[PDB]
Design a protein around this ligand. Sequence first.
Ligand SMILES: Cc1cn([C@H]2C[C@H](OP(=O)(O)O)[C@@H](COP(=O)(O)O)O2)c(=O)[nH]c1=O
Ligand SMILES: [Ca+2]
Length: 129
Amino acid sequence: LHKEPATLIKAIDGDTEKLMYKGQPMTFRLLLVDTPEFNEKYGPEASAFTKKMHENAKKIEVEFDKGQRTDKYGRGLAYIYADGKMVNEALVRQGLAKVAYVYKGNNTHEQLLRKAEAQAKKEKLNIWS
Ligand SMILES: Cc1cn([C@H]2C[C@H](OP(=O)(O)O)[C@@H](COP(=O)(O)O)O2)c(=O)[nH]c1=O
Ligand SMILES: [Ca+2]
Protein backbone atom coordinates (compact mmCIF):
# COMPACT_ATOMS: atom_id res chain seq x y z
CA LEU A 1 0.00 0.00 0.00
CA HIS A 2 1.09 3.60 -0.42
CA LYS A 3 0.23 7.03 0.90
CA GLU A 4 -1.06 9.78 -1.39
CA PRO A 5 -1.66 13.41 -0.67
CA ALA A 6 -4.86 15.13 0.36
CA THR A 7 -6.11 18.23 2.11
CA LEU A 8 -8.93 18.76 4.56
CA ILE A 9 -12.09 20.37 3.23
CA LYS A 10 -14.37 19.73 6.21
CA ALA A 11 -14.95 17.55 9.28
CA ILE A 12 -18.14 15.53 9.28
CA ASP A 13 -17.89 13.01 12.12
CA GLY A 14 -15.77 10.32 13.80
CA ASP A 15 -15.27 8.14 10.75
CA THR A 16 -16.21 10.43 7.78
CA GLU A 17 -14.82 13.65 6.46
CA LYS A 18 -14.57 15.78 3.29
CA LEU A 19 -11.10 15.81 1.78
CA MET A 20 -9.63 17.05 -1.48
CA TYR A 21 -7.98 14.15 -3.35
CA LYS A 22 -6.37 14.48 -6.75
CA GLY A 23 -7.90 18.00 -6.69
CA GLN A 24 -11.54 16.84 -6.29
CA PRO A 25 -13.76 17.07 -3.18
CA MET A 26 -14.71 13.57 -1.86
CA THR A 27 -16.31 12.27 1.32
CA PHE A 28 -14.00 9.59 2.87
CA ARG A 29 -15.13 6.75 5.12
CA LEU A 30 -12.37 5.27 7.27
CA LEU A 31 -11.67 1.63 6.54
CA LEU A 32 -12.12 -1.09 9.18
CA VAL A 33 -13.64 1.04 11.90
CA ASP A 34 -16.97 2.18 13.26
CA THR A 35 -17.40 5.30 15.34
CA PRO A 36 -20.74 5.94 17.09
CA GLU A 37 -23.04 8.37 15.27
CA PHE A 38 -22.97 11.93 16.66
CA ASN A 39 -26.36 11.35 18.36
CA GLU A 40 -24.97 8.20 20.14
CA LYS A 41 -22.90 7.83 23.23
CA TYR A 42 -19.23 8.81 22.52
CA GLY A 43 -20.28 10.10 19.05
CA PRO A 44 -19.47 13.69 19.93
CA GLU A 45 -16.11 12.63 21.47
CA ALA A 46 -15.20 10.64 18.32
CA SER A 47 -16.14 13.53 16.04
CA ALA A 48 -14.01 15.88 18.13
CA PHE A 49 -11.06 13.51 18.16
CA THR A 50 -11.10 13.04 14.34
CA LYS A 51 -11.72 16.77 13.75
CA LYS A 52 -8.78 17.79 15.91
CA MET A 53 -6.41 15.21 14.57
CA HIS A 54 -6.73 16.66 11.06
CA GLU A 55 -6.85 20.33 12.08
CA ASN A 56 -3.62 19.93 14.00
CA ALA A 57 -1.84 18.08 11.21
CA LYS A 58 0.52 19.60 8.74
CA LYS A 59 0.21 16.77 6.26
CA ILE A 60 -2.89 14.63 5.56
CA GLU A 61 -2.49 11.50 3.46
CA VAL A 62 -4.79 8.82 2.14
CA GLU A 63 -3.94 5.18 1.65
CA PHE A 64 -6.25 2.94 -0.34
CA ASP A 65 -6.27 -0.77 0.27
CA LYS A 66 -6.09 -3.52 -2.44
CA GLY A 67 -9.82 -3.58 -3.04
CA GLN A 68 -12.77 -1.34 -3.65
CA ARG A 69 -11.85 2.36 -3.34
CA THR A 70 -15.37 3.73 -3.09
CA ASP A 71 -18.35 2.38 -1.33
CA LYS A 72 -21.97 2.12 -2.59
CA TYR A 73 -22.62 5.67 -1.32
CA GLY A 74 -19.72 7.13 -3.35
CA ARG A 75 -17.46 7.48 -0.25
CA GLY A 76 -13.80 6.87 -0.67
CA LEU A 77 -12.58 3.98 1.47
CA ALA A 78 -9.17 4.57 2.97
CA TYR A 79 -6.70 4.61 5.77
CA ILE A 80 -6.07 8.24 6.57
CA TYR A 81 -2.83 9.58 8.18
CA ALA A 82 -2.24 12.85 10.00
CA ASP A 83 1.51 13.60 10.09
CA GLY A 84 2.25 9.89 9.55
CA LYS A 85 -0.14 8.72 12.33
CA MET A 86 -3.13 6.61 11.17
CA VAL A 87 -6.43 8.14 12.23
CA ASN A 88 -8.23 4.80 11.92
CA GLU A 89 -5.78 3.20 14.43
CA ALA A 90 -5.76 6.19 16.82
CA LEU A 91 -9.55 6.12 17.09
CA VAL A 92 -9.49 2.38 17.90
CA ARG A 93 -6.64 2.79 20.39
CA GLN A 94 -8.61 5.44 22.29
CA GLY A 95 -11.80 3.41 22.56
CA LEU A 96 -13.62 5.86 20.23
CA ALA A 97 -14.11 3.29 17.46
CA LYS A 98 -14.61 -0.45 17.16
CA VAL A 99 -12.92 -2.60 14.53
CA ALA A 100 -15.79 -3.26 12.06
CA TYR A 101 -16.71 -3.73 8.42
CA VAL A 102 -13.79 -6.00 7.73
CA TYR A 103 -14.44 -7.11 4.20
CA LYS A 104 -12.09 -9.56 2.42
CA GLY A 105 -9.67 -7.82 0.06
CA ASN A 106 -9.72 -4.48 1.88
CA ASN A 107 -8.36 -5.74 5.22
CA THR A 108 -4.57 -5.11 5.03
CA HIS A 109 -4.39 -3.32 8.44
CA GLU A 110 -6.95 -5.54 10.36
CA GLN A 111 -4.64 -7.12 12.77
CA LEU A 112 -2.84 -3.80 13.55
CA LEU A 113 -6.17 -2.32 14.43
CA ARG A 114 -7.32 -5.38 16.40
CA LYS A 115 -4.17 -5.03 18.53
CA ALA A 116 -5.14 -1.41 19.28
CA GLU A 117 -8.67 -2.44 20.20
CA ALA A 118 -7.38 -5.05 22.65
CA GLN A 119 -5.26 -2.37 24.42
CA ALA A 120 -8.24 0.02 24.50
CA LYS A 121 -10.37 -2.68 26.01
CA LYS A 122 -7.77 -3.61 28.66
CA GLU A 123 -7.49 0.06 29.64
CA LYS A 124 -11.33 0.13 29.69
CA LEU A 125 -11.29 3.33 27.58
CA ASN A 126 -14.33 5.22 26.46
CA ILE A 127 -16.56 2.72 24.59
CA TRP A 128 -15.03 -0.10 26.67
CA SER A 129 -15.75 1.69 30.05
C1 LIG B 1 -16.54 1.00 6.22
C2 LIG B 1 -17.38 0.51 5.06
C3 LIG B 1 -18.76 0.69 5.02
N1 LIG B 1 -19.52 0.25 3.99
C4 LIG B 1 -20.98 0.41 3.97
C5 LIG B 1 -21.60 -0.76 4.75
C6 LIG B 1 -22.77 -0.17 5.45
O1 LIG B 1 -23.97 -0.22 4.59
P1 LIG B 1 -25.37 0.19 5.25
O2 LIG B 1 -25.50 1.73 5.19
O3 LIG B 1 -26.25 -0.50 4.26
O4 LIG B 1 -25.46 -0.26 6.65
C7 LIG B 1 -22.37 1.29 5.66
C8 LIG B 1 -21.86 1.60 7.02
O5 LIG B 1 -21.26 2.89 7.07
P2 LIG B 1 -21.54 3.91 8.24
O6 LIG B 1 -20.97 3.24 9.45
O7 LIG B 1 -20.81 5.16 7.85
O8 LIG B 1 -23.04 4.09 8.32
O9 LIG B 1 -21.37 1.52 4.73
C9 LIG B 1 -18.91 -0.47 2.96
O10 LIG B 1 -19.62 -0.87 2.00
N2 LIG B 1 -17.59 -0.69 2.94
C10 LIG B 1 -16.77 -0.25 3.95
O11 LIG B 1 -15.58 -0.51 3.92
CA1 LIG C 1 -20.42 5.22 12.05
